[PDB]
Amino acid sequence: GETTDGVYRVMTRRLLGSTQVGVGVMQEGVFHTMWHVTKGAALRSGEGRLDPYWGDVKQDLVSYCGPWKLDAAWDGLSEVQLLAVPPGERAKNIQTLPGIFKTKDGDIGAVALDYPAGTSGSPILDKCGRVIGLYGNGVVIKNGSYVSAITQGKREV
């Protein structure tokens, strides 16, 4: 069905009514989302079917119809926009300066914005509108609030 570039809601009719389980990015005929949103399951876009192509539980990423296409990266200095798509609410850009997750394998940018878990998969953008990562995987801090990493996949060849 619909394969136009843009941000999409990931819904389910398994629970009560229509529930939003997450968000995703359609770019170059590939649907990109977080692994914990779909658990690698098949998706529907009208009459059409989207089959998983690549996935990894540790990176918490998954692609549909083709290999991961998003390769933009945070510059480590500039503010970014979370194009948050919350359940039952309109797509909304929120500008913030990301912090840093310091790990044994390197540093990763992190946005300190709290949203309903069904917002996971929402894209984080740079000043050019390029998707530098996805929102939805991070940590819970002292005040009970969430700080998500800027999770980006790898583009092959």
Partner: protein
């Protein structure tokens, strides 16, 4: 069965609502893709 619905274009919005802090955190990432605070 899960399904997708278009929610909009991926664009940067000038004069969007600016909020949130920039915390530097020591974190660990396990095999299940779950983060944890290192202390």
């Amino acid at each position: 069965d899960m399904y997708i619905e278009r929610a909009g274009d991926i664009t940067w919005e000038k004069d969007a609502e600016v909020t949130g802090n920039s915390p530097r955190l020591d974190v660990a990432l396990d095999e299940s893709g779950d983060f944890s605070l290192v202390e």
